[PDB]
Amino acid sequence: AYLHHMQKGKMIQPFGCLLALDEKTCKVIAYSENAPEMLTMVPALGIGTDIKTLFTAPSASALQKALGFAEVLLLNPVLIHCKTSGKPFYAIIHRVTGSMIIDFEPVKPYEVPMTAAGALQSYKLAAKAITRLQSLPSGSMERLCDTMVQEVFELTGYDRVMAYKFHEDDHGEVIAEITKPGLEPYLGLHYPATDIPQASRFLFMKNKVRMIVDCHAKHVRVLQDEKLPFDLTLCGSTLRAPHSCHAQYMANMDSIASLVMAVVVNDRKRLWGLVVCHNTTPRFVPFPLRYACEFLAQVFAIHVNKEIE
Template sequence: MLAVQERSLTVIAYSENTISLLGLDTQIFSDSLLGLDVRFCLLPIVTAPLARAAASREISLVNPIWVHSRNTQRPFYAIPHRIDVGIVVDLEPAHFGDPAFTIAWVVQSQKLVVRAISRLQSLLRGEIDVLCDTVVEKVHELTGYDRVMVYKFHEDEHGEVLLEIRSWSDLEPYLGSHYPTTDVPQV
């Protein structure tokens, strides 16, 4: 079990077995998980649904959320519910051979894709900047990649990074970088 602050998703309480259950390094986390951003414990692709669940008026409608430990990639069913000081997330180990695991993954993936498509369809035509911003954001949410970029090809076929989302501030930014044609694989 993890309890997190609703807006920041920082850990405010956790059960005794959380560190070992998530496969976290006991030497690093032996003192406490308190104050740690839960995104350091779980893969980025699953923290977006967890953040959306936290923002949801009726949190029980999103249960269960399929999550993975960042360190071990071990799968869990996360069942969030509100308490007076935040959100409690019960973690139940999932097994790849479990049919419910497959169904939960398919349902979760389908929800994310439907939301992304709906958002893209709601955009006004001709607003290329808004479209690019939304595509970068939605691809980042759907894939969980640490970096998602919009790349523009110029007339001489060199490329330029126009937009970028990075999961971690310590990733070197590529925004505004130009790359020669030879850096892009030819199809």
């Protein structure tokens, strides 16, 4: 049941908007319902729209040029400007067979001159983290995980950061934790397997970093071309809305916002666990920082697998 509704991914979070394009025609074959408002000035946006009508000439050309690379050759994000408004967005591209799917995340105008500076700064901080993991003496899973949650806490600014390990019966245990002062600790607690369905663990193998900005936000529908006789697969989107059971789960534990990083060993390939960030209030972090976190989690996974041996 869970996998169907997560794979189709027809509901997104409202912090961004989504377009899907036909690789052959470059025209819009699906869009989220908030996309006309975000990207135009309400020359419309609908099924069949050409993207050269929406963005400035260098922007349209950069996206058009992405159509011609293999996915492993995609460099994200792309900085685009809207043609009428001048509004800037980060465009995050991925491919599913003959479709190109694009997530658009807003950028503040005063942030634009700092886009390269901020990207370098995020990766530099992550790189300094990697050196401290590596400097650590071997022999203690506990010290390794403490160092990791401490580094992530400083890098990401969330109220709570946990290392969550899966046991062989698939139930989980919180084995390391750092929080801001007032909060209730979860260190040492065990949780049922069913708190994280099989389908979610499966998706984490491919989508290694997941952000939920606000569990109470009103989700937005994706509309697709009525001519299509199948559903598009949108689960690779950075914007996919959380299933309502989990959004209800979040509100109950006063984690209004979250950032989760998969820890995949032998990347025998196995989901060892998760690094779980919670925030009491809504929180957004831009793509370059999440991208750096993905690499930090990869290196962490190498050290985890070393200690096992």
